[PDB]
């Protein structure tokens, strides 16, 4: 018989709480059985017991490496069901912070992938940059990661007077850090030996297994939701979509590095083209009024009271809204029954489908190869378990 | 628009072939990696000297909760229960009654800090700036019970941290 092994949950390479039951012949991997739910918190029922504003912070904690992207997806779904439109400055801020969030996520993914394979230094080099982006998060919202900044009306608050200068200062130097990481990894023969031709997946299999994002693009599929189905102002920025040709771990790593460079490009464009104006929709039956107006005028106080006690009502109907989150397609199926509380909120996490394909990807590989394949799928279990 | 990441072809002349042979047999790229690590060795580290040095924060930072007063010393809170209604974690418990002088004040204001998510929705909902998230983040305890705050603890926090809370509110209220 084969040897049965528990890989995780208490394992450095398990990416949190994951019970990988492996059947092994020697160190050859005969079967992978991922057991999840060790971080299932029942988010969707809890959301069923909240108003639309009260449910927003749950999306921060779904994928706790890309917070504002989940906030953006949920806000877009609620906006679609509300038949309202965010103001242009809010949309530009949304895209800027989405690209910053993509930078954060890609740093985490690449550095922890290298850490699992056995390279520890780039993690330390890039987490200082992560800390600076956390400072940007805190200066805009008061929290380092769980901002709750992007809301179905736009954004909570406008930028502080000196934020754009500091973002520009960080962006003009991040490319050298990317270059140093590349010098450490890209041409190293040990890295290539550990990554090239590992976890190969064909384009047809990737499509049928429900993959998205880099897990498609590494196999040559020319798909990107920001280019084919743009949402906020992504039709007004210029960038390239990196495409792989081998469908292995190495090509996906190259794609993620190139996507970081393209994110720097988009951030530059967003910094140059930030427009003036209000930062939430000028409709007090949706977005709360300013504090000065709330303490001065009767209607403003009434609407503030009602929006913070009962919340705004959403017309009945169901939507499926998806965005190109840093880990792939992130979606929300939101159903409204006409009241201030959602009837149903199904969350679609790309990591769910990506982990469901782990057994297919590990055929004919070893234990360390499976560790690399786990790293290459970019899995966070907050979104997988929900 | 798209670009390829791994679609190049090496040169097959004697010069390039010998260069690749030298790279294979003499470990050039590994030496480059060693040089990068040696370069990082001689840089100044990014470590700060905690607790003598502190990490940078902004006036918007959300930390330990506090209840505030008017300059006369009268409490700002008038027990409207908007913070209780809006709290996403149901971390706030409020009971109120008419005071001896007829004022609308609370007899119970509890925050479970082990339920709270520190989202700051209560301070946005409050119409009189009574409940705030302060700047303090160093308040770890040795027991679970010390983190179940009552009204006396929150009023003490307000009296303790008002000197910084008022200045922080002064710097950001024009954005609110």
């Amino acid at each position: 018989s084969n040897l049965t092994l528990n890989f995780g949950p208490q394992h450095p390479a398990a990416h949190g709480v994951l019970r990988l039951v492996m059947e092994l012949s020697g160190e050859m991997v005969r079967k992978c059985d991922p057991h999840i739910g060790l971080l299932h918190r029942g988010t969707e029922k809890l959301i069923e017991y909240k108003t639309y504003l009260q449910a927003l912070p749950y999306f921060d904690r779904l994928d706790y490496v890309s917070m504002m992207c989940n906030e953006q997806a949920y806000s877009l779904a609620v906006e679609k069901l509300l038949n309202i439109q965010p103001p242009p400055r809010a949309q530009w801020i949304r895209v800027l912070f989405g690209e910053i969030t993509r930078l954060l996520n890609h740093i985490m993914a690449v550095t922890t992938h290298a850490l699992d394979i056995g390279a520890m230094t780039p993690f330390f080099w890039m987490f200082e940059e992560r800390e600076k982006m956390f400072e940007f998060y805190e200066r805009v919202s008061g929290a380092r990661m769980h901002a709750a900044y992007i809301r179905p009306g736009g954004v909570h608050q406008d930028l502080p007077l000196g934020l754009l200068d500091d973002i520009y200062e960080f962006s003009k130097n991040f490319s050298f850090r990317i270059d140093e990481l590349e010098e450490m990894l890209t041409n190293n023969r040990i890295w290539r030996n550990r990554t090239v031709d590992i976890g190969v997946v064909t384009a047809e299999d990737a499509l049928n297994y429900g993959f998205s994002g880099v897990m498609l693009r590494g196999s040559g599929i020319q798909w990107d939701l920001r280019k084919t189905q743009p949402y906020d102002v992504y039709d007004q920025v210029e960038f390239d979509v990196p495409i792989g040709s081998r469908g292995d771990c190495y090509d996906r790593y190259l794609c993620r590095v190139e996507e970081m460079r393209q994110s720097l490009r988009i951030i530059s464009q967003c910094l140059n083209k930030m427009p003036p104006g209000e930062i939430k929709v000028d409709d007090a039956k949706v977005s709360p009024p300013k504090r000065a107006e709330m303490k001065t005028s009767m209607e403003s106080l009434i609407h503030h009271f009602k929006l913070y006690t009962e919340g705004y009502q959403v017309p009945p109907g169901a939507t499926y809204t998806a965005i190109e989150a840093p880990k792939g397609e992130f979606g929300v199926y939101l159903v409204s029954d006409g009241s201030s509380r959602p009837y149903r909120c199904k969350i679609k996490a790309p990591g769910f489908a990506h982990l469901a394909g782990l057994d297919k990807m590990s055929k004919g590989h070893m234990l360390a190869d499976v560790v690399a394949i786990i790293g290459t799928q970019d899995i966070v279990f907050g979104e997988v378990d929900r | 628009t798209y670009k390829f990441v791994n679609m190049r072809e090496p040169s097959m002349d004697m010069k390039s072939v010998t260069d690749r042979a030298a790279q294979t047999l003499l470990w050039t790229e590994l030496v480059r990696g060693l040089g990068m690590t040696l370069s990082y060795l001689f840089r100044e580290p990014a470590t700060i000297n905690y607790p003598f040095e502190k990490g940078p924060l902004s006036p918007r930072f959300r930390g330990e909760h506090a209840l505030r007063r008017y300059p006369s010393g009268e409490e700002r809170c008038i027990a409207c229960k908007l913070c209780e209604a809006v709290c996403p974690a149901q971390a706030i418990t409020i009971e109120a009654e008419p005071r001896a002088d007829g004022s609308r004040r609370t007899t119970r204001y509890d925050i479970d800090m082990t339920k709270c998510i520190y989202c700051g929705f209560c301070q946005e909902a409050c119409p009189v700036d009574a409940i705030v998230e302060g700047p303090n983040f160093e308040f770890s305890t040795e027991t679970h019970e010390e983190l179940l705050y009552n009204k006396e603890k929150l009023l003490n926090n307000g009296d303790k941290w008002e000197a910084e809370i008022a200045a922080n509110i002064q710097a950001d209220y024009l954005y609110r």
């Binding site: 406008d158 930028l159 502080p160 007077l161 000196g162 934020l163 754009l164 520009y168 962006s171 003009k172 490319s175 050298f176 990317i178 270059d179 590349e182 010098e183 890209t186 041409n187 460079r261 393209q262 720097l264 490009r265 951030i267 530059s268 910094l271 140059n272 083209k273 930030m274 003036p276 | 010069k15 010998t18 260069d19 030298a22 050039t28 480059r32």
Partner: peptide, 29 residues
């Protein structure tokens, strides 16, 4: 009733930001 003051890019624009890969050859034959 002064002029609107908001966080905005400076007059003109910000300086160009590098994003392309930069790995010099840096070696003998």
């Amino acid at each position: 009733a002064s002029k609107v003051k908001q966080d905005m890019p400076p007059p003109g624009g910000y300086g160009p930001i590098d994003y392309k890969r930069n790995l010099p050859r840096r070696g003998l034959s």
